[PDB]
Structure formats: structure tokens, C-alpha cells
Amino acid sequence: SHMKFTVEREHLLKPLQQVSGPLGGRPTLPILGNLLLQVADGTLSLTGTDLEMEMVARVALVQPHEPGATTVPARKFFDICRGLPEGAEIAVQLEGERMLVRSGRSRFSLSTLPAADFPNLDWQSEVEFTLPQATMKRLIEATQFSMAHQDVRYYLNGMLFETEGEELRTVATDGHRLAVCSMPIGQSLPSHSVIVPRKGVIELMRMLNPLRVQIGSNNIRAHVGDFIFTSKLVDGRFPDYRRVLPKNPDKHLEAGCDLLKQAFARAAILSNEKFRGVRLYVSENQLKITANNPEQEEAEEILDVTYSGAEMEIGFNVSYVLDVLNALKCENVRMMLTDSVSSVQIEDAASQSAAYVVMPMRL
């Protein structure tokens, strides 16, 4: 009931929007829809949590302030700040069980919950490193679509973060398809692998100038400027990707990424709405994609490709293929096959930094 700070609208907006990240719609406990506000020295700290993870933001206080802490409704406080004129001076003070917000002739009285009731994560770092935003953004964007959504194998509803030599690797799979991306970070690292929950991967993604990472036993921390993200890790046995990657593929196909995408996209229209299976007939320098549905409708596409190997028919969930092609934002695609019952590896024909593995269907 002593906390006081006056900050400019523009110094609160990005922090308020970032900390409100881990916060969901329909919070279990009312305080989880609240942000912890703490004034200590010349710093205002804003924390958001969902118990599994948290987002902290620090704002420098160059104007008079009083130390103290409270929790206040996140969306409501952000909306008040955002609704205020550009450059507005936002004067905040505690008046018992009410937080008062004044700026010009606008006055708001918000209901608070004790700072003492605010939850917090407990740990020590084992692996530490820095990397550019762009490297993280590319590692995440390349694999995130392949994460499971709400699988019973809860460790699949996340992304594996693996360090090896001078590389950071991300892996994501749902048991049907897999994505792996490796990037050199310019630092020698100890071989460590952790599973980051999908809600965290999304939060980590949204906080992307440089980025520093601390990996622990059961936690991961990410510092990006004045923001600190922490998450609990998923305790689980993530599958080994090295074993699902085709060991010795004998068949190699090359095609234009966009022509291949447009062909699968058209064939998809007449594939089964539930199962989405298309057939691939591969033969010397040619690919034929076919699709059909219960209504007996059929699509057929013929393409000129670079292929020398055995002729084979292989069924696929066309959505899994289109997902890969939309991820590879390149000129040419390389497809590596073995037989009709085995996985196919797909990659950029000009880069081996990302690899994608898709398991076939029997149509």
C-alpha cells in the first residue's frame, strides 16, 4: 500500500504485452490473470505466470517512485495503458486493495491481489550461451509445425533443444512426421538435450537485440534485452531423430519447390477429407501424384523431376507434405526414399541445415 511509479505509456506497452504472454484465457486462479508489479530501487519489474513458465520485464524509473509490490488485472491494465494517448504520463499508486492509475483527466481504480499470493518458480544453470534472434527464430520456425498438439505422449507436445559441439539443434515430431534444424552458434557446448513445452516454444518465439540461454536440469531461461523468460522443462524420453532419419536412402528426387507444392495442393482437393492420402508413382525423371475420395473423384498431376532410381508407389498424408514444402522456403527440394513402407527425408537441395522426415500411409 506504498508502491508508486510514473512511467511513459511507451515504456509500459511492450513489457505489458510481453509479460501477458504466458497468461491464458479463463485462468484457473484469479491471481494467474494478474501481473506482479514490483518497485525496487530505480526498477519496475512486471511478472506474468502460468505456474509452468514466467515472463519478467524490467523498466527503468527516471521519475519519482516508492518501493512496494502488488498484483493487478493483466488485460485490463494493458488495455488502459494502450487506450491512453501517445506519450501519456501514467501515474500509478496503491490505495489499499485498489491500484489507482491516473493520466491527464483519466482515472482508473483496479482491484488488486496481494503480491505475497503471487506464485513463483524455484534452480542452477548447467549450459549457457548466446545466439542471434534470427538463429533462434529460424531454428523454431523450421520445426514448430511438427510438434504434437495434445498427445498423451506429453513430451511430444514440445520441442527438443539439443547442444552438440558448436551447434544448437531443435527437433519436433508427432509420431508421424519429424523436423530437425541445426545451426552453428560459434561456441563450444557440452552435449545436452532438453524438451521445451509447446506453450514455451511459442513464448520464446514471441520474445524475438541478442539472446542469451541458460539451460538447467528442469528449467530453461532466456534473456533478450530487458525481458527474462523462464520455463519448466518436459520430463520425458524424446525419440532419437538419428534413428528415424533414413540410414542409407538409395532413391534421390529433385524438383522445384513451388511446382511440387502447387501440384500437391491441387491433388489434395480430391483426397479423402479425413485421411488426406495421395499416391506418388515415381519413375525415371517423372513424378505422378494421384488422389481420390469416397465420392470417386480423382486428381492426377504429372511433373518433370530429376530422378534416377527404382520405380515405386508411395502413399502420403498430403498435409504432412505441404507442411514441409511451406516450411522449406526455397527454389529446389531433394526427396530421399528407400521403399513404400519407409520414411522419406525432404530437404532444401541447396542446404542440409534442416531435414524433414515423413512416414507413409498404406492407401
Partner: peptide
């Protein structure tokens, strides 16, 4: 189906 990677 579809087959499983693992």
C-alpha cells in the same frame, strides 16, 4: 496407414 515413425 498411416504408419508410425517410432
Amino acid at each position: 496407414x498411416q504408419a508410425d515413425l517410432f
